[PDB]
A paper describes a structure:
We recently reported a flavin‐trafficking protein (Ftp) in the syphilis spirochete Treponema pallidum (Ftp_Tp) as the first bacterial metal‐dependent FAD pyrophosphatase that hydrolyzes FAD into AMP and FMN in the periplasm. Orthologs of Ftp_Tp in other bacteria (formerly ApbE) appear to lack this hydrolytic activity; rather, they flavinylate the redox subunit, NqrC, via their metal‐dependent FMN transferase activity. In the current study, we identified a bimetal center in the crystal structure of Escherichia coli Ftp (Ftp_Ec) and show via mutagenesis that a single amino acid substitution converts it from an FAD‐binding protein to a Mg2+‐dependent FAD pyrophosphatase (Ftp_Tp‐like). A high‐resolution structure of the Ftp‐mediated flavinylated protein of Shewanella oneidensis NqrC identified an essential lysine in phosphoester‐threonyl‐FMN bond formation in the posttranslationally modified flavoproteins.
John Wiley & Sons, LtdAs the Ftp_EcY60N protein variant displays FAD pyrophosphatase activity that is inhibited by ADP, we obtained a crystal structure of the ADP complex with two metals bound. This structure provides the best model to date of the bimetal coordination of the ADP portion of an FAD substrate to this subclass of FMN transferases. In contrast to the apo structures, there are only two monomers in the asymmetric unit, and the r.m.s.d. of the monomers is 0.4 Å for 289 Cα carbons. The metal ion in site 1 in both monomers is no longer coordinated to a carboxylate oxygen atom from the side chain of D283, and thus has a coordination number of 6. Refinement of the metals as Ca2+ ions resulted in large negative electron density peaks that disappeared when modeled and refined as Mg2+ ions. Unlike the Ftp_Tp ADP‐inhibited structure, the α‐phosphate oxygens of the ADP do not coordinate to the metal ion in site 1. Coordinated to a second Mg2+ ion are α‐ and β‐phosphate oxygens of the ADP, as well as the side chain of E169. The side chain of R240 also coordinates to the β‐phosphate of the ADP. The distance between metal sites in this structure is over 6 Å, approximately twice the distance observed in the various Ftp_Tp inhibitor and substrate complexes, and we observed no metal‐coordinated water that can effectively bridge between the bimetal sites. Despite the presence of a Ca2+ ion in metal site 1 in the apo enzyme, the inhibited Ftp_EcY60N protein variant enzyme contains a bimetal Mg2+ center.
Author numbering:
A (entry chain B): 13 to 115, 121 to 214, 224 to 241, 252 to 329
B (entry chain A): 13 to 114, 122 to 212, 224 to 241, 251 to 329
């Protein structure tokens, strides 16, 4: 079965969709639908866009409920929860600190860091869901929400839903470092995804890999760029949004604390760490269950 | 390639789990963990158990936020939204009307009276980083998650499989199923409805699995159209369960409009005089095996 691969730009990075058994006409039509949806998601979420739904909330000083879409509500909810579960390491309110670091020319003082830390905190954000509407609510006017670190994962999940709505049940889709697959590839086998150096089958799941994809990461506790020997983390989770959120959180925590969260939460994770000259690797038991022989 | 098949009781119905290739010690430990988790989900969601998390909320007359678990918040959020998207057909607040029909048939007057104690607009979910809440603006509101509890449990069982390093399985709770990977013959799990492969998806089939009435909230009466059966394939079994109930309540014509609009994978059976006829959405057909 011949596989069509579609590719384009979104959110400062790239997207891909591999779809077996679709003709040229259907391919062109789907590429248009895909790009249209991704552009919409970018318009929903981008901090690089002055007029995005999210930046409109960020510009607002209101402390009352601010209406948002179902997806916005869910992305924030997931981010808030995984934030708590990673001891605040994954923090969508860390924006003020990111800007402080030119995220780069001049290094901020601890005094400047402290001042900006006071404008952040996951405790300041609430999601309100009802049948016909939903809201974000902040209790700090200066709160700044940045969903950069989960936007690729959401986009990939949403691409998967689009495939389903289009009657496409076999696909591998990706946005930046986030991927989702379902069903069989061209050769009637579960989609294979290669990992930074092994191969996994993550059908029915999302996977996210650390790194910079747009054209960075700050420890919310210290208000400084991250350190540690953890050079790469890969998370497999039920959705790519979740995988993205865990991935960033774990990357911030570093090897020792990350493993503690991984163990407690029963996460499927693969880490590459640097030990002097060379590197060592670590996989949770849950991660190994996804490996293909 | 041998398949362990586990089975037990939960939520007034039965759960099932097919797992390829594991020894008896594993099968034994899993059964214990599965039953333990399903028991906890029942303690969370059951309208029978007077002391369930859900019944404690129902028992309260407070109109202020009531703390619940993440699962509870998410189940309710999904239920509220799919309720809206099925024009109120799927309605977790319909309990007062259900109880009314539990003696003698109520009049339309008695029905209209109880309608006043219902409405999806009365329920709010509040999510924060370290806690989350349900909130009702009507003390007498009664929440019943019977129609989604099976789907949630099947999804949660899938999460249990994953946390337990199991990559190939078919789990079911009542009419709700999830599957992943290859069965005891290297082929994707086959689900009889026509047969489908729904690996990586939830599926729910209409019907009674507990040991009652499905009420049309618009009329406040038992449903009485010619939609014999509806099956939904969705990203999760919770969603499938919720859609399935909504579309069953809506009946054939209205259900098809929702299915078209929302792009759902749905299979319907309707009664045409003496014979039946079938209908599949384009999306459902992508799951058919031959
Ligand atoms: N600790 C954090 N938690 C959540 N978001 C963060 C954190 N630190 C930085 N960010 C945001 O995430 C971005 C990095 O996102 P990522 O997708 O990993 O790389 P990039 O966006 O540079 O491709 C930063 O530019 C910043 O907007
Ligand atoms: N329209 C509705 N929306 C949501 N729940 C309903 C509705 N009508 C009835 N219910 C509740 O759902 C139950 C039916 O659930 P279901 O799983 O479809 O069948 P059963 O519980 O009989 O196996 C009823 O007993 C009642 O508690
Ligand atoms: Mg990136
Ligand atoms: Mg990320
Ligand atoms: Mg049932
Ligand atoms: Mg149902």
């Amino acid at each position: 079965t011949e596989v069509t691969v579609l590719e384009g730009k979104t959110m400062g990075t790239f997207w891909r969709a591999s779809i077996p058994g679709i003709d040229a006409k259907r391919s062109a039509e789907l590429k248009e639908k895909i790009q249209t949806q991704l552009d919409a998601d970018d318009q929903l979420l981008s901090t690089n866009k002055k007029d995005s739904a999210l930046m409109r909330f960020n510009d607002s000083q209101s402390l009352s409920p601010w209406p948002v879409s179902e997806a916005m509500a869910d992305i924030v909810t997931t981010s808030l929860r995984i934030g708590a579960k990673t001891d605040g390491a994954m923090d969508i309110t860390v924006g003020p600190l990111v800007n402080l670091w030119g995220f780069p020319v001049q290094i901020p003082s601890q005094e400047q860091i402290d001042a900006m830390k006071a404008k952040t905190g996951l405790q300041h954000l609430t999601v309100i869901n009802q049948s016909h509407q939903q809201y974000l609510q902040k209790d700090l006017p200066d709160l700044y929400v940045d969903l950069s670190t989960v936007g690729e994962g959401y986009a990939a999940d949403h691409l998967a839903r689009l495939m389903e709505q289009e009657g496409i049940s076999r696909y591998l889709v990706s946005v930046g470092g986030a991927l989702n697959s379902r069903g069989m590839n061209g050769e009637g086998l579960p989609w294979r995804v290669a990992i930074q150096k092994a191969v996994v089958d993550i059908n029915g799941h999302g996977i996210s890999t650390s790194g910079s994809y747009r054209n960075h990461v700050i420890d919310p506790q210290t208000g400084r760029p991250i350190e540690h020997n953890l050079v790469s983390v890969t998370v497999i989770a039920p959705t790519a949004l979740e995988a993205d959120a865990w991935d960033t959180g774990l990357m911030v925590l570093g090897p020792e604390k990350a493993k503690e969260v991984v163990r407690r939460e029963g996460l499927a994770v693969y880490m590459i760490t640097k030990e002097g000259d060379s590197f060592k690797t670590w996989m949770s038991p849950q991660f190994k269950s996804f490996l293909v022989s």
